[PDB]
Amino acid sequence: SMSVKKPKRDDSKDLALCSMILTEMETHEDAWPFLLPVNLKLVPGYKKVIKKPMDFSTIREKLSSGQYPNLETFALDVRLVFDNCETFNEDDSDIGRAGHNMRKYFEKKWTDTFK
């Protein structure tokens, strides 16, 4: 509360570390469904069904331009990528599988880097 603060967590490396994690996600062989925005002209249903589209290139631009106020807003956009994927794709599809693999991969790096 006022004039009563928890001890200061060092957050000065967060930007760089989120960038590294993102690089690793970008270079994973199963990243291909997620590298770019889904083409809303060419994929029936996507526009209406997925209220908040998200992809790695868009997270990368947001990161590079100071649009994440903190590391939690970054993790939210990453998880949004996988949550969207699960909404639109059967678990037993290449894309559905890619999304479960990438989420698992992300969550481990997240915990190992920050928790």
37: DSSP letter: -
Q: 109 is written with which tokens?
A: 């790096």
DSSP 43-80: STTHHHH-SS---HHHHHHHHHTT--SSHHHHHHHHHH
**Those residues with Cβ within 8 angstroms of residue 18's Cβ, 6 or more apart along the chain or in another chain:** 63, 68, 71, 74
Instruction: Note the resolution in Å, 1 decimal.
Output: 1.8
Please indicate the experimental technique that yielded this structure.
X-ray
Of 55, 49, 63, 81, the closest CA to residue 17 belongs to 63
Domains of the chain: total = 1
Amino acid at 10: D
CATH number of the domain to which 82 belongs: 1.20.920.10
Query: What's the rounded Cα separation, in Å, for the pair 58 and 54?
Result: 7
32: DSSP letter: G
Instruction: List phi, psi (to 5°) of 8.
Output: -70, 95
Q: 73 is written with which tokens?
A: 């807003």
Query: What's the rounded Cα separation, in Å, for the pair 72 and 37?
Result: 22
Report the chain's C-alpha Rg in angstroms. Answer: 16
Breaks (C-N over 2.5 A) in the chain follow: none
* Residue-number span of the structural domain to which 45 is assigned: 1-115
